Write a protein that binds this ligand. Structure first.
Ligand code: CNC
Length: 337
């Protein structure tokens, strides 16, 4: 069936995160989709992020069941990992066939994708401040470090081959370089068909730059809208910044959706002026499906009891559909398969 997955934080203090399914053909929402496919097994507490990697869906939770690896189509569990570490799991970042990264509120971990052995790296620069998103690119991990913490760490690059050493120990001072990309909050990484990476700098003074990272790791910057906000490391969520392989980017700025490019990074024109009265953005806020030309938007009310998903045309901004539903879900992000 045509649709999208919604990763839910879940109701902190009351139950787990969960996976909902917005069926577009039915214009219906189905809840607890992982649970109902896996004989009552559940995600952890605060399911914040998921990642597609080598045909599997990795779903992170901050606490308890910190990682579930599942089939993207069926949601049948490959591995329900339980607690990986004494650090909160934020995101999964793929390195290769053998290894991934788990980001945290302080440090980051290497995870073996066969065994689930989790090694937390405690002496890699100022990654003690927290790690957000990241991406594997041209033999390097590009890592969103919490620039708001002590020492103002900028984006790190780390050699994947060094990270993937079979002799890696938690105290190894794995070499890094800093890129000139301040990330005072959480950012995201988009790979385009040019073979470059796109991300969002947010500086100490709150200026937002769209940053192209080249295959050489040299930078080109252009100013985004000043009213763009990253996600806060105070309560880590995936940032709103996303985009297509064609170089069309989307972000939330001043509570409105913008379509942007590298040539038009700070648009005055919105994608849409859509509101529903008393619904505000939550979680990641937006994600684009490049395969369908669809932008999905997630909202809830001020008391968190009522939820809204809206599906737009990603080119023109016209509303295709919406669905309103009750419950303490706290939507985190969208996944398209
Ligand atoms: C609103 C909110 C929320 N909060 Co606060 C945020 N942002 N929060 C707040 C505020 C509560 C009061 C208010 N203004 O309504 C506010 C700003 C004070 C707060 C505070 C904090 N929050 C924090 C975080 C990280 C979190 N918060 C969430 C619970 C995050 C929530 C999201 C979620 N998925 O649950 C959240 C969006 C919704 C809570 C709610 O209204 N639920 C409905 C209500 C009917 O249920 P309830 O059981 O009575 O809710 C109570 C608890 O949620 C409690 N509480 C709230 N946050 C925390 C955090 C912890 C660690 C603990 C033990 C309790 C809480 O306060 C609520 C009383 O109204 C969280 C899941 C968000 C996220 N997705 O990461 C997350 C906890 C993750 C985890 N598994 O540990 C802070 C550490 C932020 C910071 N750096 O200061 C801090 C810790 C407070 C503490 N207890 O020590």
């Amino acid at each position: 069936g045509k649709g999208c997955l919604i990763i839910n934080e879940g109701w902190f203090g009351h139950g787990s995160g969960s996976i909902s399914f917005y069926n577009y053909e039915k214009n219906s929402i189905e809840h607890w989709c992982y649970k109902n496919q896996n004989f009552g097994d559940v995600l952890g507490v605060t399911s914040q992020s998921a990642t597609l990697w080598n045909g599997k869906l990795y779903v992170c939770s901050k606490e308890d069941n910190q990682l579930v690896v599942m089939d993207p189509k069926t949601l049948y569990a490959e591995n329900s990992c339980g607690k990986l570490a004494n650090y909160q799991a934020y995101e999964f970042i793929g390195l290769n066939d053998d290894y991934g990264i788990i980001t945290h509120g302080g440090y980051f971990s290497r995870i073996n994708l066969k065994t689930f052995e989790t090694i937390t790296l405690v002496s890699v620069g100022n990654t003690y401040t927290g790690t957000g998103s990241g991406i594997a690119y041209n033999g390097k991990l590009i890592l969103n470090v919490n620039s708001s913490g002590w020492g103002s760490p900028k984006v790190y690059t780390i050699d994947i081959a060094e990270l993937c050493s079979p002799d890696l120990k938690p105290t190894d001072k794995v070499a890094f370089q800093e890129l000139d990309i301040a990330t005072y909050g959480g950012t995201r990484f988009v790979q385009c068909k040019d073979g470059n990476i796109y991300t969002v700098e947010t500086t100490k003074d709150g200026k937002n730059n769209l940053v192209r990272i080249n295959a050489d790791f040299s930078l080109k910057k252009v100013a985004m809208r000043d009213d763009y906000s990253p996600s806060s490391f105070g309560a880590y969520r995936e940032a709103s910044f996303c985009g297509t392989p064609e170089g069309i980017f989307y972000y939330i700025a001043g509570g409105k959706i913008y379509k942007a490019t590298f040539d038009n990074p700070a648009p005055e024109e919105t994608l849409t002026e859509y509101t529903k009265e008393g619904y505000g953005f939550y979680g990641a806020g937006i994600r684009v499906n490049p395969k369908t030309n669809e932008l999905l938007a997630m909202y809830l009310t001020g008391d968190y009891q009522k939820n809204l998903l809206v599906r737009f045309n990603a080119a023109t901004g016209e509303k295709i559909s919406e669905i309103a539903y009750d419950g303490y879900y706290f939507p985190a992000t969208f996944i398209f398969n």
